[PDB]
Amino acid sequence: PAVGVVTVKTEPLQITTELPGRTSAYRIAEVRPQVSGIILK
């Protein structure tokens, strides 16, 4: 009986959440006419 052995200790682990998501500008503005009428150009 001789086996490869790895004695266990405390190992700091920074592995953490890998979770979902969607992305957005910021920077996610719009252009809304504040003056009404016909678009000339």
Instruction: Report DSSP state, residue 8.
Output: -
Size of the site for a copy of itself (CB under 8 A): 5
Near a copy of itself by CB under 8 A: residue from 29, 30, 33, 35:
29
Cα 37 to Cα 23, 33, 41: the distances in Å are: 34, 9, 12
Binding of residue 35 to a copy of itself (CB under 8 A): no
Residue by residue, what is the 3-state secondary structure of 21-32?
Answer: CCCCCCCCCCCC
Binding of residue 28 to a copy of itself (CB under 8 A): no
Interface contacts to a copy of itself, rule CB under 8 A = 29, 34, 37-39
